[PDB]
Design a protein around this ligand. Structure first.
Ligand SMILES: Cc1cc2c(cc1C1(c3ccc(C(=O)O)cn3)CC1)C(C)(C)CCC2(C)C
Ligand SMILES: Cc1cc2c(cc1C1(c3ccc(C(=O)O)cn3)CC1)C(C)(C)CCC2(C)C
Lengths: 208, 12, 208, 12
């Protein structure tokens, strides 16, 4: 069973240096979030590790993006600060930052994506059965299927006048996939050049 | 090998 | 209007050198396919160009992957040849090739994805409203929405015992997104080093 | 600037 109520409960529990500081802080919150997603903590520990190492940056991007709906031309960080796109551009990361604004924040704003929908999309990303090394991909696939069954039922009840809303939510996941890949590429470069402080948890996520 | 993440997941 | 019957009609109209040869051949077929997708040819010419330049490699990957369901540990090329994963590995592209087999071909095989579903996923990719430069993103978004409405209705009628099938089809699109990005990165490297013949259409798709 | 693609799309 996979009740949206529990997924919501889990949710409601230089500029680049600021952003990396906020990401490290939020990685601790992400672990606490995943443990509250039904059945995640019952997976083998090694598989919990695999799923979070595979999805962490997409999970973080989805969350701050949704928190940024009320920010004009910028994002809200976990530390409470805003980053405006002018500042992102002046730090050399303007293109990937604008993709977050255009493909994620502005779309979440325009459809008024709610926190239950965000949480369910977050849980679908978490339960990624393509993650390499999983001891039982089918088990993770089954949990993903339970989430998107629950999400579809929620959308049809809450937004009956929008039959396409469920598909619209899922069709933000390719953009999230692409944005995450490019964000990660930038972060690996920051680590290589060494001029950006990276705290311990964020650093560990950049290990092999 | 993912020290912090293991440390945080295992503890209840 | 966006009838699945018309989408199906559109569908039914060294190793790396072999693969690139097949890709160039199929780019001509892809243009003919897109023109047969309802309403694509009525978009402004510049927007048709934008959508095909944004989606071509994902569109090609989805097609050969589906055509490869009956191949053991390999793919079927447009030229009719097979490429086995041993040969892909021996050419230096084993990892991305295995991702195609694991995340796309094997999943299409296991759910017995049919050609109407493949065509509709292909049309959703084509009508990508995030493509940069579109004169009217909302128009493309509306066509995407018509496709996935038609796809959902088709799945519910043909596979009533699989309520999750529609979502399952859409949730192959992040994998397709990621695989396409990595495939394109390899192809740009082949062009840079210059040791792999690249024919005219495939080359043009690698222009700015 | 995308010569072949334009050439193929424009012709009916
Ligand atoms: C680390 C990181 C770096 C970057 C980004 C996102 C993050 C992440 C992140 C996660 C969480 C939070 C937070 O909750 O405040 C903030 N940032 C890792 C996702 C974006 C996409 C903004 C583009 C620019 C760069 C600098 C490359
Ligand atoms: C060009 C190209 C290169 C590669 C791939 C796919 C293609 C594409 C393609 C398209 C169409 C056809 C065909 O229909 O037969 C065959 N290939 C462009 C998508 C994969 C993913 C197999 C990994 C290895 C490399 C060599 C990097």
């Amino acid at each position: 069973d996979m009740p949206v109520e529990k997924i919501l409960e889990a949710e409601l529990a230089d500029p680049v240096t600021n952003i990396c500081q906020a990401a490290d802080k939020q990685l601790f919150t992400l672990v606490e979030w995943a443990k509250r997603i039904p059945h995640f903590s019952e997976l083998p520990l090694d598989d919990q590790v695999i799923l979070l190492r595979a999805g962490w940056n997409e999970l973080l991007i989805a969350s701050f993006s949704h928190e940024s709906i009320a920010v004009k031309d910028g994002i809200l960080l976990a530390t409470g600060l805003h980053v405006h796109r002018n500042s992102a551009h002046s730090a050399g990361v303007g293109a990937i930052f604008d993709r977050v604004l255009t493909e994620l924040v502005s779309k979440m704003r325009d459809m008024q994506m709610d926190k239950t929908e965000l949480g369910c999309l977050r849980a679908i990303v978490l339960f990624n059965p393509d993650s390499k090394g999983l001891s039982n991909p089918a088990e993770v696939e089954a949990l993903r299927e339970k989430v998107y069954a629950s999400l579809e039922a929620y959308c049809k009840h809450k937004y009956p006048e929008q039959p396409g809303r469920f598909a619209k939510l899922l069709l933000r996941l390719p953009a999230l996939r692409s944005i995450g890949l490019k964000q990660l590429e930038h972060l690996f470069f920051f680590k290589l050049i060494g001029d950006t402080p990276i705290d311990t948890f964020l650093m560990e996520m950049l290990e092999a | 090998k993912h020290k912090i993440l293991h440390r945080l997941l295992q503890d209840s």
